[PDB]
Amino acid sequence: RNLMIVDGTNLGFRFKKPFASSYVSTIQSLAKSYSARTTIVLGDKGKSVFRLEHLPEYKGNRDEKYAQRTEEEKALDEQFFEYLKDAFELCKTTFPTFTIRGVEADDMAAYIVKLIGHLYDHVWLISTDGDWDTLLTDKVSRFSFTTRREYHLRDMYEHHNVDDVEQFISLKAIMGDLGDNIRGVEGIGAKRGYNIIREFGNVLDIIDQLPLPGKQKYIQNLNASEELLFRNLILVDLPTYCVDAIAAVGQDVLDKFTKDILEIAE
Ligand SMILES: [Cl-]
Ligand SMILES: [Cl-]
Ligand SMILES: [Mg+2]
Ligand SMILES: [Mg+2]
Ligand SMILES: [Mg+2]
């Protein structure tokens, strides 16, 4: 009776020897565990056109690390990606399996939840990515193979130091993301960020009130950061921008994906 959506490239890193059969078996076990009536496997192909258009430096740190690999280190990664390609090929014989050049799996997942989540009792997201918790609701949860935790909306403070999704999204916008090369406001950690949000509202409401009262240096920093906050919200507000992120590579591509997903449902 549930929907299960797999962050498939993310799951691939469990194995990072062909692993296609093992990969598919894992997904089957998961589908059983989570009573999945429907399982959809997603993968990352290329780079996020939507986010690179807004921030050319997006994941630039990761690109730099890839560029500094030796030829032999690179060849090994290519092998992993070949085995992963084979895993997706095999997976496609068994489950609906999607990749879209220039679109992050994150955006595809967010869109699926919005489009068909209402037809299922519960939605289970299979991802180690905390970013995916921007999708949590009373009927959408996440499972992580690295931490072994099941992530629920009711436990958002335990996991993310905020009480709800709106706050989570705003906190990410304020703090940025070191891993993905998104700059944050200097001097604002999770505590101060949560406190700011609880006082002034979400990031859009914060922007509307700049400059905010307060003599502390982090407030002065925040007051100077209108542009950064607005841009960051676009980069991190996965539910708001998922449709735009897909449409970035062509409206026709989005239309095909919609058609494909609606076919799977029902
Ligand atoms: Cl909940
Ligand atoms: Cl702006
Ligand atoms: Mg991702
Ligand atoms: Mg992500
Ligand atoms: Mg992140």
Swiss-Prot record:
Positions with a binding annotation for DNA: K59
Reactions it catalyzes: Exonucleolytic cleavage in the 5'- to 3'-direction to yield nucleoside 5'-phosphates
Keyword vocabulary terms for this entry: DNA replication, DNA-binding, Early protein, Endonuclease, Exonuclease, Hydrolase, Magnesium, Metal-binding, Nuclease, Potassium, Viral DNA replication
Signal sequence interval, chain numbering: none
Region (DNA-binding): 164-200
Pfam families assigned to the protein according to its UniProt record, in alphabetical order: 5_3_exonuc (PF01367), 5_3_exonuc_N (PF02739)
Cofactor: Mg(2+); K(+)
Protein name listed in UniProt: Flap endonuclease
Means of activity regulation: Inhibited by p-hydroxymercuribenzoate (PHMB).
Top-tier EC class: hydrolase
Described function: Catalyzes both the 5'-exonucleolytic and structure-specific endonucleolytic hydrolysis of DNA branched nucleic acid molecules and probably plays a role in viral genome replication. Active on flap (branched duplex DNA containing a free single-stranded 5'-end), 5'overhangs and pseudo-Y structures. The substrates require a free, single-stranded 5' end, with endonucleolytic hydrolysis occurring at the junction of double- and single-stranded DNA. This function may be used for example to trim such branched molecules generated by Okazaki fragments synthesis during replication.
Cellular component per GO, a single term: viral replication complex
Residue positions binding Mg(2+) 1: D106
Binding residues annotated for K(+), in chain numbering: V185, I188
Stimuli inducing this protein: Expressed in the early phase of the viral replicative cycle.
InterPro entries named among the record's database cross-references: 5-3_exonucl_a-hlix_arch_N, 5-3_exonuclease, 5-3_exonuclease_C_sf, DNA_polI_H3TH, FEN, FEN_D15-like, HhH2, PIN-like_dom_sf
Organism, as annotated: Escherichia phage T5
Residues that, per the record, bind Mg(2+) 3: D131, D177
Variant or mutagenesis effect after changing C242S: Complete loss of inhibition by PHMB
Variation of activity with pH: Optimum pH is 9.3 for the exonuclease activity, 5.5 for endonuclease activity. High pH favors the exonuclease activity whereas low pH favors the endonuclease activity.
